[PDB]
RNA sequence: UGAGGGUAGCGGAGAAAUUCCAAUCGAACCUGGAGAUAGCUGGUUCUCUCCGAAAUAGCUUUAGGGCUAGCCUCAAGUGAUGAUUAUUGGAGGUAGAGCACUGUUUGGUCAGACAAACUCCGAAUGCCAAUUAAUUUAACUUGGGAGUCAGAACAUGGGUGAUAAGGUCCGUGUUCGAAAGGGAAACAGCCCAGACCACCAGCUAAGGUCCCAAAAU
RNA sequence: GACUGGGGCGGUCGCCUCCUAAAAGGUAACGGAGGCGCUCAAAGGUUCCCUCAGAAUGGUUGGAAAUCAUUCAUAGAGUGUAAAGGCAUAAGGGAGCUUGACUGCGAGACCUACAAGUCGAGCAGGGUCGAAAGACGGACUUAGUGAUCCGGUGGUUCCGCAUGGAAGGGCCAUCGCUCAACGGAUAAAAGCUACCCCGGGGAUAACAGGCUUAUCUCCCCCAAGAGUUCACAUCGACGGGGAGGUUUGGCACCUCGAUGUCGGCUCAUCGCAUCCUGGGGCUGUAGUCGGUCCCAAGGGUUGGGCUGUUCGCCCAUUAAAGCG
RNA sequence: UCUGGUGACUAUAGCAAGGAGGUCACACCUGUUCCCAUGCCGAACACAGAAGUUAAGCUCCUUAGCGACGAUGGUAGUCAACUUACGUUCCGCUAGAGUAGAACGUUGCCAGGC
């Protein structure tokens, strides 16, 4: 199954990205890091 | 009996938009293509989906370089 | 029954029949030939009938080379149907000739035997042919 | 079978046929809502002057209807940006031809052949340009008003059909549509040619010169 | 529901690539031939290096195509998934670090009725690989999708009906569709009419006219052979060429404010491709009878049973029981 | 000119058989003390370098067998015109593909040492 998810920053509580993952190849939550809007920095992101 | 056929894609207008010798501006689209039938030359930038366009504004030339390969250049002074 | 083993497409457009022959104008193997002078399709049943007619009068004392082959198939729909709603199945196979093209060649037989041996095959072919000997 | 009576329209009566209910009954008649509604038919009345189309695209509970775009018209505004050849540059793979590739194919690596979905090659024209010269007179912009969305033959490139139809579906050109006149015996589409009105003058086109019937037995 | 070589029945409806498409773009048919409604946390970014298919020879013979080495190769393999254009600049084949599968934008142009769709140098904010110049806002390229209204979820420096709060609305970010008849009538929908009724159309069918001649009816060329030998007395294989416009059809031009449809009675009339009679030519014609083919339309061409019959089959005749 | 670097005109430069040459250089070649290297291997990419040789590479020269290039002349098509219905003809432009002759064993730029 491929189900879209919606990332969220941790230090600031705000959804700011969308992705899609494969439920077989990655059963655990995705933990990339991307540019944020409030801090002008690059904190983490996690579903 | 029946037919299993018909059913075509419509069109994508896919050829030369500007012609050899005229003053093109800074972002004009110079060719639409699948693959690279005609290469980007100098002062010309190949875009994504291979649609090469101009960068600085000047005259255009379609010039040959190899055995079966071609390129498009744009030169500055008009 | 002359037909290709496999063709890449079974339903083709009809071939063009005006002008003059592309190539195959000269006798090149045998010694006497049969060149057509009018344009028509020939449909591979009228080559089974003009080959055997040449074979019997020669008493199988020479060789026969047919220099055409039906490549192109031609269609037809059954009787008492309305127009459109498809394109019919393959009926048979045609071959186009144009005025100049050698059809048949013979070798290994005399001239006055072969001249009365090619007349028995032009009356089973539609086109008006004549009797051409080799380039000298 | 006479006489007097009863059942009434979303209703009566029916030994049952959609049968009868004031010459009409798959749901009577009369005035009212009501000038119901109609993308469908017929009709629409005075005269001259100038310009003069379309029968195509896209979407539609759409296919004989509608809306925007295309083609005509009147007025304002920019003002050679419109057309035509001559020279010049360049994009592109048709006709033709050829098997180097993908498949087809006849006779002993050699000789020969075939191709809408094959190309080592490849015209004639067309198309886009220069801001270059020569002849001509259009062209874009903003606003007012409609029409048209059933097209037809002939010529010439091809599809479908049977190298069938005055067949049907697309590309380019002309005439009819909206066009009289001379010719084709008669005949919207073929060939010559575009009528401002008058004349009992003239020279010619397509086609014609014995006679009907103008002109050479 | 609509298209529909009348309607029904079957089929198909949107997006992608090729061909017909007539060497720029564009271009139709119930014309020819295939896919799509997804998948990848590495199959994406960057940096450094490598080049393939098969052929042939050899040996645990795993046919030399399991694996193994040498030559030859010019692109004949491969590129997530159809086909076209494209590339060993690699856009193909392996490793390490990695999140640009970024936030705010966007001069210009392609394309187009409108709504949308597509490419975009460059400027700032934060980053990543590389020594650096530099490259990177997804994948070799194009398909993998759906207006509005309405509701749900997280944020908000916006309003909040006397004032202070709140219930509510606003913008930014995302979610609910085989609305697949894919520009989507509504949150919600199948039939019968020969009991039928109004508005239209020869724009569109059934009968007849017309064009065409695949079918249908006759006619002919070549000649293998059947006929003791013998192609042509007679028959005419496999193949080729036409005429007629009676059959079954194809096209939808004339008539839907009427062209109203089969056979036999009554009465005709014309064609020659002749059933009878008249005149000939061959004959495998002894004689009687026949068979074929050519000239010939002047007259003639029966009476009944069975069927609504068209064909037809039978019974008794006759010079003959002609086809249109 | 003559050698090496380095971009251009890009098979008229190629591919293949022969033949000549080497302190000026490029190579061939010996090595693993280390940075560096194999998903197997100093073969390769690095790195150290008295010695060893023109054999292959590169460099020069000639032979045109193979690939590439290619006229003139004629034909096929075809824009325009005139009759025409014929698998058409005649006239005026343009001009192919194949084939013959032939050109052909590269023409040059810029810095560095002879
Ligand atoms: Mg814009
Ligand atoms: Mg737009």
PDB file of N, CA and C (backbone and C1' of nucleotides) in Angstrom, chain E residues 84-99:
ATOM      1  P     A E  84       8.220   2.313 -31.881  1.00  0.00           P
ATOM      2  O5'   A E  84       8.320   3.897 -31.896  1.00  0.00           O
ATOM      3  C5'   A E  84       8.002   4.634 -33.065  1.00  0.00           C
ATOM      4  C4'   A E  84       7.866   6.105 -32.770  1.00  0.00           C
ATOM      5  C3'   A E  84       9.156   6.897 -32.659  1.00  0.00           C
ATOM      6  O3'   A E  84       9.666   7.292 -33.917  1.00  0.00           O
ATOM      7  C1'   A E  84       7.751   7.418 -30.845  1.00  0.00           C
ATOM      8  P     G E  85      11.229   7.157 -34.234  1.00  0.00           P
ATOM      9  O5'   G E  85      11.897   8.345 -33.414  1.00  0.00           O
ATOM     10  C5'   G E  85      12.107   9.616 -34.012  1.00  0.00           C
ATOM     11  C4'   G E  85      12.281  10.704 -32.978  1.00  0.00           C
ATOM     12  C3'   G E  85      13.652  10.830 -32.340  1.00  0.00           C
ATOM     13  O3'   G E  85      14.597  11.500 -33.147  1.00  0.00           O
ATOM     14  C1'   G E  85      12.025  10.883 -30.659  1.00  0.00           C
ATOM     15  P     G E  86      16.074  10.898 -33.304  1.00  0.00           P
ATOM     16  O5'   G E  86      16.639  10.860 -31.815  1.00  0.00           O
ATOM     17  C5'   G E  86      17.070  12.055 -31.192  1.00  0.00           C
ATOM     18  C4'   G E  86      17.407  11.888 -29.729  1.00  0.00           C
ATOM     19  C3'   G E  86      18.675  11.146 -29.380  1.00  0.00           C
ATOM     20  O3'   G E  86      19.833  11.924 -29.594  1.00  0.00           O
ATOM     21  C1'   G E  86      16.950  10.552 -27.888  1.00  0.00           C
ATOM     22  P     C E  87      21.111  11.281 -30.307  1.00  0.00           P
ATOM     23  O5'   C E  87      22.011  10.786 -29.103  1.00  0.00           O
ATOM     24  C5'   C E  87      22.517  11.716 -28.167  1.00  0.00           C
ATOM     25  C4'   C E  87      22.695  11.093 -26.809  1.00  0.00           C
ATOM     26  C3'   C E  87      23.805  10.071 -26.682  1.00  0.00           C
ATOM     27  O3'   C E  87      25.049  10.694 -26.448  1.00  0.00           O
ATOM     28  C1'   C E  87      21.835   9.283 -25.624  1.00  0.00           C
ATOM     29  P     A E  88      26.317  10.371 -27.368  1.00  0.00           P
ATOM     30  O5'   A E  88      27.191   9.418 -26.461  1.00  0.00           O
ATOM     31  C5'   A E  88      27.031   8.021 -26.567  1.00  0.00           C
ATOM     32  C4'   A E  88      27.466   7.330 -25.311  1.00  0.00           C
ATOM     33  C3'   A E  88      28.965   7.207 -25.110  1.00  0.00           C
ATOM     34  O3'   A E  88      29.468   8.345 -24.441  1.00  0.00           O
ATOM     35  C1'   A E  88      27.880   5.127 -24.682  1.00  0.00           C
ATOM     36  P     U E  89      30.738   9.149 -24.986  1.00  0.00           P
ATOM     37  O5'   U E  89      30.289  10.675 -24.878  1.00  0.00           O
ATOM     38  C5'   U E  89      29.665  11.179 -23.700  1.00  0.00           C
ATOM     39  C4'   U E  89      29.674  12.689 -23.661  1.00  0.00           C
ATOM     40  C3'   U E  89      29.137  13.343 -22.399  1.00  0.00           C
ATOM     41  O3'   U E  89      30.055  13.348 -21.324  1.00  0.00           O
ATOM     42  C1'   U E  89      28.287  14.460 -24.304  1.00  0.00           C
ATOM     43  P     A E  90      29.553  12.961 -19.852  1.00  0.00           P
ATOM     44  O5'   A E  90      29.529  11.370 -19.892  1.00  0.00           O
ATOM     45  C5'   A E  90      28.472  10.633 -19.306  1.00  0.00           C
ATOM     46  C4'   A E  90      27.308  10.543 -20.251  1.00  0.00           C
ATOM     47  C3'   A E  90      25.961  10.261 -19.634  1.00  0.00           C
ATOM     48  O3'   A E  90      25.410  11.444 -19.080  1.00  0.00           O
ATOM     49  C1'   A E  90      26.254   9.002 -21.622  1.00  0.00           C
ATOM     50  P     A E  91      24.522  11.408 -17.744  1.00  0.00           P
ATOM     51  O5'   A E  91      23.056  11.143 -18.288  1.00  0.00           O
ATOM     52  C5'   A E  91      21.987  10.865 -17.399  1.00  0.00           C
ATOM     53  C4'   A E  91      20.895  10.077 -18.073  1.00  0.00           C
ATOM     54  C3'   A E  91      21.334   8.775 -18.735  1.00  0.00           C
ATOM     55  O3'   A E  91      20.344   7.772 -18.513  1.00  0.00           O
ATOM     56  C1'   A E  91      20.316  10.197 -20.342  1.00  0.00           C
ATOM     57  P     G E  92      20.396   6.851 -17.194  1.00  0.00           P
ATOM     58  O5'   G E  92      21.109   5.526 -17.682  1.00  0.00           O
ATOM     59  C5'   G E  92      20.365   4.511 -18.328  1.00  0.00           C
ATOM     60  C4'   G E  92      21.249   3.379 -18.769  1.00  0.00           C
ATOM     61  C3'   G E  92      21.981   2.646 -17.666  1.00  0.00           C
ATOM     62  O3'   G E  92      21.179   1.689 -17.007  1.00  0.00           O
ATOM     63  C1'   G E  92      23.509   3.206 -19.340  1.00  0.00           C
ATOM     64  P     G E  93      21.320   1.468 -15.427  1.00  0.00           P
ATOM     65  O5'   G E  93      22.809   0.947 -15.242  1.00  0.00           O
ATOM     66  C5'   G E  93      23.126  -0.399 -15.547  1.00  0.00           C
ATOM     67  C4'   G E  93      24.572  -0.730 -15.279  1.00  0.00           C
ATOM     68  C3'   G E  93      25.042  -0.689 -13.839  1.00  0.00           C
ATOM     69  O3'   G E  93      24.647  -1.819 -13.093  1.00  0.00           O
ATOM     70  C1'   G E  93      26.633   0.358 -15.199  1.00  0.00           C
ATOM     71  P     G E  94      24.328  -1.692 -11.527  1.00  0.00           P
ATOM     72  O5'   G E  94      25.704  -1.236 -10.872  1.00  0.00           O
ATOM     73  C5'   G E  94      25.869  -1.237  -9.462  1.00  0.00           C
ATOM     74  C4'   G E  94      27.317  -1.085  -9.074  1.00  0.00           C
ATOM     75  C3'   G E  94      27.571  -0.469  -7.707  1.00  0.00           C
ATOM     76  O3'   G E  94      27.490  -1.420  -6.660  1.00  0.00           O
ATOM     77  C1'   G E  94      28.915   0.610  -9.325  1.00  0.00           C
ATOM     78  P     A E  95      26.938  -1.005  -5.210  1.00  0.00           P
ATOM     79  O5'   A E  95      27.835   0.241  -4.799  1.00  0.00           O
ATOM     80  C5'   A E  95      28.025   0.608  -3.443  1.00  0.00           C
ATOM     81  C4'   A E  95      29.358   1.284  -3.271  1.00  0.00           C
ATOM     82  C3'   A E  95      29.371   2.549  -2.435  1.00  0.00           C
ATOM     83  O3'   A E  95      29.448   2.279  -1.051  1.00  0.00           O
ATOM     84  C1'   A E  95      30.549   2.920  -4.445  1.00  0.00           C
ATOM     85  P     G E  96      28.201   2.587  -0.096  1.00  0.00           P
ATOM     86  O5'   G E  96      28.554   3.989   0.573  1.00  0.00           O
ATOM     87  C5'   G E  96      29.545   4.084   1.583  1.00  0.00           C
ATOM     88  C4'   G E  96      30.339   5.363   1.486  1.00  0.00           C
ATOM     89  C3'   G E  96      29.645   6.632   1.939  1.00  0.00           C
ATOM     90  O3'   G E  96      29.635   6.787   3.348  1.00  0.00           O
ATOM     91  C1'   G E  96      30.771   7.024  -0.106  1.00  0.00           C
ATOM     92  P     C E  97      28.263   6.646   4.180  1.00  0.00           P
ATOM     93  O5'   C E  97      27.645   8.115   4.196  1.00  0.00           O
ATOM     94  C5'   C E  97      28.121   9.103   5.098  1.00  0.00           C
ATOM     95  C4'   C E  97      28.569  10.350   4.374  1.00  0.00           C
ATOM     96  C3'   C E  97      27.523  11.434   4.197  1.00  0.00           C
ATOM     97  O3'   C E  97      27.389  12.250   5.342  1.00  0.00           O
ATOM     98  C1'   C E  97      28.594  11.049   2.132  1.00  0.00           C
ATOM     99  P     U E  98      26.038  12.209   6.201  1.00  0.00           P
ATOM    100  O5'   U E  98      24.891  12.351   5.109  1.00  0.00           O
ATOM    101  C5'   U E  98      24.098  13.523   5.049  1.00  0.00           C
ATOM    102  C4'   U E  98      23.834  13.933   3.628  1.00  0.00           C
ATOM    103  C3'   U E  98      22.399  14.294   3.296  1.00  0.00           C
ATOM    104  O3'   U E  98      22.084  15.635   3.634  1.00  0.00           O
ATOM    105  C1'   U E  98      23.308  12.862   1.623  1.00  0.00           C
ATOM    106  P     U E  99      21.207  15.963   4.939  1.00  0.00           P
ATOM    107  O5'   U E  99      19.758  16.265   4.365  1.00  0.00           O
ATOM    108  C5'   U E  99      19.433  17.561   3.886  1.00  0.00           C
ATOM    109  C4'   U E  99      18.818  17.515   2.509  1.00  0.00           C
ATOM    110  C3'   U E  99      17.330  17.819   2.466  1.00  0.00           C
ATOM    111  O3'   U E  99      17.031  18.412   1.205  1.00  0.00           O
ATOM    112  C1'   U E  99      17.693  15.656   1.641  1.00  0.00           C
TER     113        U E  99
END
